[PDB]
Write a protein that binds this DNA or RNA. Structure first.
Ligand SMILES: [Cl-]
Length: 144
DNA sequence: GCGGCGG
């Protein structure tokens, strides 16, 4: 029992993103879906307060990204976060990591509760963060 | 036209 309240769709590189504001008996939330070029779906759910936090943080990630030069690569593998933030809502944790690999820079958004439990993540090309931010802002202006 | 380092 989830009533749809508003939607936005974005095409970013080979991916499509849907931002949907919905409501159930406990309240309102925003669902963020990533659809890969092959059709693979990944989704995260956000309280509206968390969504606004997310929207706020995207600007600093974009500022940081815009200032970067070329990666540089030694001869060992690397994870490395270029930049990290974490958000919390109740028992849910959201990790925002700006990362680089051979496929470019991207924002990893990961949702977790416990080590042995359900996990969800989306991966947003760094070039799409401004567009994504402004889409989130449009929905936030209409809700909560 | 991708593609995102797990248990
Ligand atoms: Cl809330």
């Amino acid at each position: 029992v989830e009533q749809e309240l508003a939607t936005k769709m974005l095409q970013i590189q080979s991916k499509r993103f849907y931002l949907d504001v919905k409501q159930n008996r406990r309240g309102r939330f925003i669902k963020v879906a990533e659809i890969g070029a092959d059709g693979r779906r990944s989704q995260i759910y956000l309280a509206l307060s968390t969504a606004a936090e997310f929207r706020d943080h995207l600007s600093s990630f974009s500022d940081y990204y815009a200032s970067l030069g070329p990666p540089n690569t030694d001869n060992l593998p690397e994870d490395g976060k270029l930049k990290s933030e974490m958000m919390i809502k109740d028992y849910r944790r959201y990790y925002l990591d700006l990362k680089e690999n051979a496929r470019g820079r991207f924002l990893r958004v990961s949702q977790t509760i416990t080590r042995g439990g359900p996990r969800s993540q989306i991966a947003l090309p760094a070039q799409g963060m401004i567009e994504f931010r402004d889409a989130l802002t449009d929905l936030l202006e209409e809700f909560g």
